[PDB]
Amino acid sequence: SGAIYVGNYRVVNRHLATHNDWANLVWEDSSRDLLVSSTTAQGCDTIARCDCQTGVYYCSSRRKHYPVSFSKPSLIFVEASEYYPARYQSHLMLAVGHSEPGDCGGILRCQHGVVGIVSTGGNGLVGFADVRDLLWLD
Numbered sequence: 036s037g038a039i040y041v042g043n044y045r046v047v048n049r050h051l052a053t054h055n056d057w058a059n060l061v062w063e064d065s066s067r068d069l070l071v072s073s074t075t076a077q078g079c080d081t082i083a084r085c086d087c088q089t090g091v092y093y094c095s096s097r098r099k100h101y102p103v104s105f106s107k108p109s110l111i112f113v114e115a116s117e118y119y120p121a122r123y124q125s126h127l128m129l130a131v132g133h134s135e136p137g138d139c140g141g142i143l144r145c146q147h148g149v150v151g152i153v154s155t156g157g158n159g160l161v162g163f164a165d166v167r168d169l170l171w172l173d
């Protein structure tokens with residue numbers, strides 16, 4: 036679990052969005068595993084606008100933050116789950132690191148701000164949904 040709170044927006048993994056997120060929907064994209072909903076309160080976070088390929092992410096299954104080197108956002112094949120059929124997920128960045136299903140939503144940050152959130156994993160890999168291209172979040 037986990038979300039980004041920026042301005043009057045809440046960014047979550049689309050597969051973990053609540054009834055309230057869908058009732059206050061701003062934008063969603065199944066191909067990216069992202070959903071953005073509106074909030075009444077002003078958010079705590081700031082978004083990176085950069086091309087960093089190193090950062091630190093929060094791993095809830097270890098209660099720890101880990102440093103990572105990650106690939107540029109790209110189209111990556113993701114196997115079927117209870118939430119999606121087998122498909123290509125776009126704007127996804129991979130890194131070597133630990134992840135379990137409940138780890139989705141953990142923030143990845145660089146020196147400039149929030150880069151993205153955990154969205155995939157397995158076998159010593161972790162995948163992050165990039166949010167740096169969503170300029171309208173600001």
Ligand SMILES: NC(=O)[C@H]1CCCN(C(=O)Cc2cncnc2Cl)C1
Pocket residue numbers: 050068113116118119124134135136137138139154155156157158
């Ligand atoms: N973005 C998706 O399609 C995810 C939907 C939830 C299920 N997905 C996973 O990768 C679950 C997972 C498994 N093992 C280790 N880390 C993780 Cl995060 C895929």
Ligand SMILES: [Zn+2]
Pocket residue numbers: 083084085086087145146147148
């Ligand atoms: Zn950066």
